[PDB]
Amino acid sequence: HSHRDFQPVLHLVALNAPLSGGMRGIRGADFQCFQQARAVGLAGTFRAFLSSRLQDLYSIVRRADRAAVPIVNLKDELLFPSWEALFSGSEGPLKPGARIFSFDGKDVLRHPTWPQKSVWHGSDPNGRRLTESYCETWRTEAPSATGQASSLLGGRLLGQSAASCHHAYIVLCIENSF
Ligand SMILES: [Zn+2]
């Protein structure tokens, strides 16, 4: 990684281990993206790609970087043309053979560290928070509670599934601004 000023990019990178609903909160989830990112030398601002009590997944990326700046993976490969494109309501269709990588470089969708290939997002297809399904703002992992998740094997990044919070799923980290 070396990128150019007139060449903006935002990385969607995965946390190194699957996590249940009991994420200690977004403050706790946010801190893990931070640690892991700088453990591998990444100079950006990483926030947990989730919808919480006081925020929508949409509002993680600063306005100036929402309309054009491409969303790439840890390998710089293209995921989404832009953030608006992602949150336009098509539930982020993963293009043919696109792959997401964890900070330590594992291909999340094909590595045994992630038995369950779903992503925790707690949002609707337009990146808005769902207070009835975001594991009580990622504080609980009670099987009775549920969080919005997407099945990477269903080809989407924002599929809609109220999933039991005891589940250890993938958690993503979006660089908040290039
Ligand atoms: Zn890069």
Every domain of the chain and the residues it spans: 1-178
Where do the H-state alpha helices sit in the chain? 26-39, 83-86, 135-138
Q: What is the largest CA-CA distance in the chain?
A: 48
φ and ψ at residue 21, rounded to 5 degrees: -60, -35
φ and ψ at residue 37, rounded to 5 degrees: -65, -50
Strand order in the sheet with 10-14: 46-49, 172-175, 10-14, 71-72, 78-80
**166 belongs to an annotated ligand binding site:** no
Resolution (A): 2.9
**Burial letters for 17-51: b for 16+ Cβ neighbours within 10 Å, e otherwise?**
ebbbbbbebbeebbebbbebbeeeebebbbbbbbb
For residues 16 and 104, the answer to whether their CB atoms sit within 8 Å is yes
Helix, strand and coil percent figures for the chain, each rounded to 5: 20, 25, 55
CATH of domain 1-178: 3.10.100.10
Token pair in block for residue 113? 């560290």
End-to-end CA distance of the chain: 13
Token pair in block for residue 135? 């594991």
Q: Which residues are near ligand 1, the ion (C-beta closer than 5 Å)?
A: 1, 76
**104 belongs to an annotated ligand binding site:** no
**Cα separation, 9 vs 21, whole angstroms:** 29
Distance 175 CA to ligand 1 centre (A): 11
**Cα separation, 119 vs 50, whole angstroms:** 9
Instruction: Name the experiment that determined this structure.
Output: X-ray
